[PDB]
């Protein structure tokens, strides 16, 4: 019962059940003339600014205060220190959760079982630094004596989304770098379409697997290895073409990679929190190590803000709390992330793993089942595209959907005297104004009247033209999307998800839920082999397997 | 009250409220030994097959029968005929809804205000046919006498998602075609990154805008025009480089496109239903007109199945009904679409516009507000990636999420003796088996015991290892993903969404909800111009605008 047994939690339920009607945005903006000023946060990293405007939420000062009391009372401050100090807060796996050590630029000693982890972090980083410089300069040559023109990452999940989202987002900083490719799906299409344009002489394969036993990754890695070896024919040619990002040295070695080509990381680095480690090799390689270092520093900035700022004015804490409000009180299943930035088109997708794999849990620290909601379904596409696809439902559908709107004030392509970004900004501001204010029958009526129509004509059309409004949103507006700020953005959401799991009392850092599917896939594999029918399962799985064998021959 | 006033609807509520506990999948599979056979649909298009297996749903025969009775009683059969006969079922705009005429390969006369629309459909199609043949053969030359190597589509929403999703999906059929690019966001990045690799001599721009007044599309189209004219310098060079896909001739002409270069379509072609019209020019151009014709034919096949098959065995109807069950009875906000196919990676996104823009409505045919849920939030990523990102929440989160699993039995890249697809299939089957069966405390306990652990060790770990299961899914398995089948797939979901809006009594074919945002963006635009602060809005919009002016100079 943890959450629901909490006195501040219970106090919130009663207020909510009592004031819900009092929560109208339009009216809330009449009441407080500087609502904006009281519900916004200006952070200055000294490398640009981030405005967190949370004023368009169904919230009051009283609510915010009660939300902060819940966070204190549930041990957010202390949980937080346990994380930074290297304690084993991943309680089911008995692990430390230290993505924060990866970008610990100050090199404060962080101990895990007495041992400072930092000398190992800084070491792989220098290895990274020298390897990037060699590959980028052309010093690193391939087997026929050529320079690398193409970097190909092989990994799935955390070994995939981070790299890709970041390289897609930091595109402008990549001119002096080799091209990157990301092969992730076991679907043979993924590898086949990539390989069919590459030249093995100028290609570098990165096998990013924390365990180095993930089925799809290892079989994509073998397929590539076979493709390469048809050209190279000399097995030692593999050492100039393949590198590994893992924790398991023995497995790396058994795959044939030169131990000198292994960049390692640690069990305390979670997959969906790993872009900051050796897993980001493809980012640095593409955009330069210097920019990678800057990405890590932005995250270091946000780390420091998270750890030392009081909750009432703590960006990640505020975001976590607003989410709990909509999830455990208003009942909302989802949360949209809508970056008005084309380079950020994989952002939302990145947080689907980041939020959902972390917080889609139902067991408590006590081993008790939750009797309340946990993580939302996170989704979204970049604006303004989204506007022309699914906003109709956000404005006039039957569900409440809290949304995060994000945008840089300065664009990397100020074309046509900055006309494009101007229209982009104008739509970013108006969508939230419109989700807020809506439009009553009267306003629409007055418009139809003006458009010169006549009440008998428009009588049937009018209601379809009404917007109820009162829909909540956050607006996060930062100076420019550079590696520094992008680092601060990501780390902000990381701590958001963290605060949430603490209030919920779950484990944000394991993922036991992945297991059953993998167990069952292992038994189905050999069964697919003959043309003989299967009967060892439920009638559905059998029926499918059997239609498959019949059709494969068709 | 329409839906909720329906006697069969009310009968369902009581049964539901009464038998919910009886709805356990595991047990339902013990009871009926050929549940599979009674809850599956084998369609044979004669160009491959589509298995619709709906057996892993919380449903019984009784429920299905009551669901079918609801569809009949709410006029699904008749609504359907009104659509095919050209009636004005888009009741708020007073339009006919005829995406089905676009792919009416039999050329049955379909009348709109007495006039057969088919001679106009077939005409633009032949124009399409000849233009594709000229551009593909190299006969069509650019201003410096060169062949086209690059086709660039400019449009947003429906003028964008369809083309892109289909070209991404039919990639293998595109070798003899020019490359395609899709510029959609007003964000200047989108155009700038595309243009910076193109050669204006071998580039063809397509301006796809139904109204030809969409802000972002027209401003991207001007920017491209400016880029081109810096090289060409002769305004008449525009006629060999720009084509338009619109309804508004006058607007096309006022933009400077040669009327001979205009491919038109009709007001009765909805944006999110337009890939079948002249809007698919970029598909045919890339994959050949013959394959486009095949895509249209597959949709024609499904059209015929939809119209003439009795509801109890009608694919789109069955899919619609299962969705209404989860939405209006179980309460689920969403619906995941999980194609286990890398080429289908934009599929889900395509249906976000397709489902959500159509059915995110709240006003009835009577102008009454709905007092029940409408369209779900549709989302998803292709498997197996999804597995390594958000499945943890589907298996062990606190929300029920109906999922559609899709896959071809035959892959276009049977590499390594079809090992890759084999693993892909095995995961496709096991995920649904696992969402179904789960794993009790006892099973997990027995496993931990076996892994040689000891009850005092594992006592705290055990519950995290339990899967409750009982989670519903559909499995749609088709022979191979060709243009024909892809056409049948898309048309199937189109009619799914259609059946739903009818049962809900809403309008699936307008989108009034897009308007307010556009109205408000129009006023914010000029305000962003000076360095002078704005005060004409709520404190939030003002605060944002003002932070923007301060930062843009920073």
Swiss-Prot record, chains A, B:
Q: Main subcellular localization, coarse class?
A: cytoplasm
Q: What class of enzyme is it?
A: isomerase
Q: Which GO terms describe its molecular function?
A: carbohydrate derivative binding; cytokine activity; glucose-6-phosphate isomerase activity; monosaccharide binding; ubiquitin protein ligase binding
Q: Where is the active site?
A: 357 (proton donor), 388, 518
Q: Which residues carry this modification: N6-acetyllysine?
A: 11, 141, 453
Residues that the record marks as modified (Phosphothreonine) are: 108, 249
What residues does D-glucose 6-phosphate bind to?
A: 158-159, 209-214, 353, 357, 388, 518
- Modification type N6-malonyllysine: residues: 453
Q: List the disulfide bonds.
A: none
Which domain of life, per UniProt? Eukaryota
> For the modification Phosphoserine, which residues carry it?
106, 184, 454
- Any idea which UniProt keywords this protein has? Acetylation, Cytokine, Cytoplasm, Gluconeogenesis, Glycolysis, Hydroxylation, Isomerase, Phosphoprotein, Secreted, Ubl conjugation
Question: Where are the N6-(2-hydroxyisobutyryl)lysine residues found in this chain?
Answer: 33
Which sequence positions carry the modification called N-acetylalanine?
1
**Which positions make up the signal peptide?**
none
Which is an annotated Pfam family here?
PGI
Residue numbers of N6-succinyllysine PTMs: 453
Self-association state and partner proteins as the record states: Homodimer in the catalytically active form, monomer in the secreted form.
The record describes the protein's role as: In the cytoplasm, catalyzes the conversion of glucose-6-phosphate to fructose-6-phosphate, the second step in glycolysis, and the reverse reaction during gluconeogenesis. Besides it's role as a glycolytic enzyme, also acts as a secreted cytokine: acts as an angiogenic factor (AMF) that stimulates endothelial cell motility. Acts as a neurotrophic factor, neuroleukin, for spinal and sensory neurons. It is secreted by lectin-stimulated T-cells and induces immunoglobulin secretion.
Q: Which PANTHER family does the protein's record reference?
A: GLUCOSE-6-PHOSPHATE ISOMERASE
Q: What is this protein called?
A: Glucose-6-phosphate isomerase
Q: Which organism is it from?
A: Sus scrofa
